[PDB]
Amino acid sequence: ATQDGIQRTVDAAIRPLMAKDGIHGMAVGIVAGGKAYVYNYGVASAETGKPVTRDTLFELGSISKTFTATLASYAQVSGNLSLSDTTGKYLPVLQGSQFGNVKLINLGTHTPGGLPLQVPDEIHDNDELMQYFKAWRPSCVPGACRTYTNPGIGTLGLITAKSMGEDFTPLMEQRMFPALGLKNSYIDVPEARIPDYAQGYKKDGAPIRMAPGVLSAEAYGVKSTAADMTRFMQANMNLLPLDAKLQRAIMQTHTGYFKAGVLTQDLIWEQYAYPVALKTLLAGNSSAMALKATPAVEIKPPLAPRQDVWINKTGSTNGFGAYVAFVPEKQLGIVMLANKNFPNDERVSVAYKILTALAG
Template sequence: MIVPARLVRFLALVFLSSCLMGAAAGADQRDEIAKAVDRAFQPLLKEHDVPGIAVAVTAGGQQHFFNYGVAAKDTKAPVTKDTLFEIGSISKTFTATLASYAQALGKLSLDDHPRKYMPQLSGSAVDEATLLHLGTYTAGGLPLQFPEGITNTAEMTAYFRQWKAGAAPGAQRRYSNPSIGLFGHLTGIAMNGNFARLIETDIFPALGLGSSYIRVPEAAMGNYAWGYNKAGKPIRVSRAVLDAEAYGVKSTAADMIRYVEGNIQPDRLEPAMKQAVEGTHVAYFKVGEMAQGLGWEQYPYPITLERLLAGNSSSMIMEPNAATPLKPPHRPTEPTLFNKTGSTNGFGAYVAFVPAKKIGIVMLANRNFPIPARVTAAHAVLEALSKMP
């Protein structure tokens, strides 16, 4: 059968036209995303004296990067998608992923008690809790930080041995670095390895993160932004007991949006890592309108800004809150927003994503500016993304 030349030309024009229309639509969407991000984040530089911000967005499988300001005031080096930032407590989601991975490999159970891995804690109040309680801040009221003077593993162990619970395990959530820090420490023991090394050799590579670190190597120091404290002085996080487990990760916008995409579509990961990531999406306790999982905090979506701000308020960080166990614990079946804030003395970060919508956002900054401003900006962008075709 001979196809007429006119028909061939017509079909070619139709195909070309559809390609051009698709490209135009893609360009229009990129422009709309850029407007939404600029509108939400550019004002924060001046309002909160933030030297630099990196924002990464994923929508429908497409990544978009937006960079503002400088990584260091003295050199004026611009922020890029490859600039390293301290992500603070967002590190806890990696700690959770390692523990979930260890459980997938049969190395531990979340129902285990600390004494299984640290016999010296046998008979202590903290040993009444399970690994699950430690990983969800529900062990009985461990404080936000260690008391001053805890500088090594021996002192850390002595502290946990003498600590007195203020509530029964599972009764209240009190956000705590020592709690999830011990959770990560015990996970490292269960896996017969050093926690930081396990994160860097087992977790980051399996998630496709090539520029994320606990201890930044010399070769990557040139990409490491300087953070700035309240006085505007350059600062970076210092070593401390269980710092790696609680707030020790340094990463880039490019790596973090890849991490978000791995959480949005874990089917792309190898089986044990897929199971690990899905394990961090299980909700175990209801705390107000927030559901607490391992690392991530969850909310039904769509969500109003007021509700999201309430879940990320200072009272949720600084005070004990009643916790109701979810029976059985479960992964969400309805659209859900996952989020986590992170801060060190010189850096501020925020991550949020909605798997059902295939949208997510990462914000990394080299100043610890107020969490409500971060959440408000990210919420505005997610609202814009959710309305795009």
């Protein structure tokens, strides 16, 4: 009945969106009054007609970075590292180099002083990456310049791993996902679950799934279900009784570090004063914020986590589109998972339309 009233709102945004953009399959997770509801639409694969189900895996894209941010936060709370530390401390290869003096906080907030969006094609392993970093020079002010980057948060992943004497993928698959209670969440999809892996579709309609690469696990590599992400949102609103340290780690990813345009940059999470206007969300989640070196102002001291915000992250691959938005003070959230990289403007609009109707 509560579920039926929410379904009617969610259907009324999603059916038309999928018809308009020719999205084959979507899984939408809602959190309302702290409860998880999951609504599935269309087909995992157009070729076979396998429907989207509870167990269907979508590529999270850059939403993976929130898991990386969570793991770094955990290592901080455990005293494995400080975010004030330099990359040099953990990758001595880089001690003496300019990049070796970039602080971890700058890697988790896209403020390292200029880094490319994508790991450049010439870098094929962590050793060629380390070399590139030795050569690296800052092209804007660290802690005053926001350049959205995979290698940045990626390298925070690698440094987090080292701090905890363990490789990244296993840290995530064997400690983090189980500690968060996520049983359908994978960097490496097991053979047994490959039937669950939804088919991605390019803009033209050709089938595709993501390619692994340098720092991909740390940057864009996670697959998950709406149910799993719905539980991630509940965790990110302090609603699940977990061990104190993991609970503190998760909420401290919400600390506000830099003001950049209309956006507050947390540890990967980007947040807005609630209530929030559509036009604010659209400007904060513009391609310009994603592609361009934007002025960033350090918040002194860092802004404590707060309930009264709209916290979001976008995520894309060649074949998939994903969007997480939640509002801690309302126990309210949406994750949209699509097997098409459909425009971010529409993701933000539809999320805005749905969470606004549910707020009252």
